[PDB]
Amino acid sequence: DPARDPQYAENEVDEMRIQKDLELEQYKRSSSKS
Amino acid sequence: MIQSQRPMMLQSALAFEQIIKNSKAGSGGKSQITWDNPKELEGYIQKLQNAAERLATENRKLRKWHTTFCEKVVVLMNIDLLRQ
């Protein structure tokens, strides 16, 4: 159950969402051949 | 209080509501107090205000803590474990 769906937060989850996406997308774009 | 869902506040707020309801049991008569003699109503209000003061105090503590925990969590998620 990592989803943590039956929970609510505004500032914590929004900022984590934004940061989570920004970092992962940058690492994908690095286009490593590994 | 529903913004936090902590029973600390939801349960005691019900106790406050009960104090209100206890007075509300005579609402039909309260509707006519001020017109003739406001002192009786002053008593009913003071009772509710004393409860309101207790609940307001708990609300302030709740808001203080809520901000405190929010601020620290939003910092932790920005800390790279490999550096800091």
From Swiss-Prot, chain A:
Belongs to the dynein light intermediate chain family. This is Cytoplasmic dynein 2 light intermediate chain 1. The chain holds residues 310 to 343 of 351 of the full protein. It comes from Homo sapiens (Human). Acts as one of several non-catalytic accessory components of the cytoplasmic dynein 2 complex (dynein-2 complex), a motor protein complex that drives the movement of cargos along microtubules within cilia and flagella in concert with the intraflagellar transport (IFT) system, facilitating the assembly of these organelles. Involved in the regulation of ciliary length. Expressed in bone, brain, kidney, and cartilage. Lower expression in heart, liver, lung, placenta and thymus. It is linked to Short-rib thoracic dysplasia 15 with polydactyly: A form of short-rib thoracic dysplasia, a group of autosomal recessive ciliopathies that are characterized by a constricted thoracic cage, short ribs, shortened tubular bones, and a 'trident' appearance of the acetabular roof. Polydactyly is variably present. Non-skeletal involvement can include cleft lip/palate as well as anomalies of major organs such as the brain, eye, heart, kidneys, liver, pancreas, intestines, and genitalia. It is found in: Golgi apparatus; Cytoplasm; Cell projection, Cilium; Cytoplasm, Cytoskeleton, Cilium basal body. It comes from the Eukaryota. Light intermediate chain of the cytoplasmic dynein complex 2, a multisubunit complex composed at least of eleven different proteins. The cytoplasmic dynein 2 complex consists of two catalytic heavy chains (HCs) and a number of non-catalytic subunits presented by intermediate chains (ICs), light intermediate chains (LICs) and light chains (LCs).
